[PDB]
Amino acid sequence: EGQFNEDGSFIGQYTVGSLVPRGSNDITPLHVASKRGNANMVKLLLDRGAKIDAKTRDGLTPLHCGARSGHEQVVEMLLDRAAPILSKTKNGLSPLHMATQGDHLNCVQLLLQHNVPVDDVTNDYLTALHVAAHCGHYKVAKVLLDKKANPNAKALNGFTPLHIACKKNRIRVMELLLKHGASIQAVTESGLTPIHVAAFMGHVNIVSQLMHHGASPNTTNVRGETALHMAARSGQAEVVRYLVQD
């Protein structure tokens, strides 16, 4: 009865890789076609019935791969053939998080136009706006905020996109969030404000900018520390010099 199956040793050997065996054929031809952005290959494979929601070991669907690399035509083609828009990877990343991570304005808009909830969260409770603040993607953050992403949304450890822009020294995103209503006095799980976070990592320009917008330097965390205590505990001499000289 095996005579009525596909046989041979070449099926699946030329999808990815170059003579080095891979443990499982989790990466399908549709994943490869979407990562490359070849809409002709995608239409070919979808017409032959390729599984549109197949997942890799990490849980990436073809829609995740197309959005991660910003291949707008592939993404629309997958969405028009009903690829699940909210499919998540093992750590909770939707295709919108991956489009945001690659600073792909076209694919972020395209997913938002297909009714992806703008504040869909990962397992760390990161929205796409959190990810844009982490990467410093000003353009995409502005798109998410225009579609009403919550600028005070909290991750698991209580960080808002503003806390993250301050931890990662993203001055443009920090300024954009403040213009769009991110609370400068928002507090994390351990009582830290955005100026505590910038002062600890030594981001002097962010500390001064937060000071211009009314950040209180005398606020204290759960452990009783002000921003100057944390700048002194970490040794950021220029943050220390700025706080005392002001």
Numbering used by the authors: 251 to 496
Please, what does the article write about this entry?
In agreement with our understanding of ankyrin structure, the Nfasc ABD peptide extended into the inner groove formed by the ANK repeats. However, in contrast with the antiparallel orientation (N-terminal to C-terminal binding) observed in other ANK repeats–target complex structures reported for ankyrin family proteins (Nav1.2-AnkB, AnkR-AnkB, etc.), the AnkG–Nfasc complex adopted an unexpected parallel binding orientation (i.e., N-terminal to N-terminal binding between Nfasc and ANK repeats). Although we used the Nfasc 1187 to 1214 segment for crystallization, only the Nfasc 1198 to 1214 region could be clearly traced in the electron density map. Unexpectedly, we found that instead of the more easily formed antiparallel intramolecular interaction, the fused Nfasc ABD bound to another AnkG molecule from the neighboring asymmetric unit, forming an intermolecular interaction. Thus, we believed that the parallel binding orientation was not induced by the short covalent linkage but represented the native binding mode. We next examined the specific interactions between residues responsible for their binding and found that the AnkG–Nfasc interface is mainly mediated by hydrophobic and hydrogen bonding interactions. In particular, F1202 from Nfasc inserts into a hydrophobic pocket formed by I277, V282, and C315 from AnkG. Similarly, F1208, another aromatic residue from Nfasc, occupies the hydrophobic groove formed by AnkG residues L343, L376, and V381. Among these, we found that the E1204 sidechain from Nfasc forms hydrogen bonds with T339 and N341 in AnkG, while the main chain of E1204 forms another hydrogen bond with the sidechain of D308 from AnkG. In our solved crystal structure, the corresponding Ser and Tyr residues of Nfasc form 2 hydrogen bonds with H384 from AnkG.
The axon initial segment (AIS) has characteristically dense clustering of voltage-gated sodium channels (Nav), cell adhesion molecule Neurofascin 186 (Nfasc), and neuronal scaffold protein Ankyrin-G (AnkG) in neurons, which facilitates generation of an action potential and maintenance of axonal polarity. Among these proteins, Ankyrin-G (AnkG) is considered as the master organizer that directs the recruitment of diverse components to the AIS. In addition, AnkG is also well known to interact with Neurofascin 186 (Nfasc), a cell adhesion molecule that is essential for AIS integrity. Here, we report the high-resolution crystal structure of the AnkG ankyrin repeat (ANK repeat) domain in complex with its binding site in the Nfasc cytoplasmic tail that shows, in conjunction with binding affinity assays with serial truncation variants, the molecular basis of AnkG–Nfasc binding.
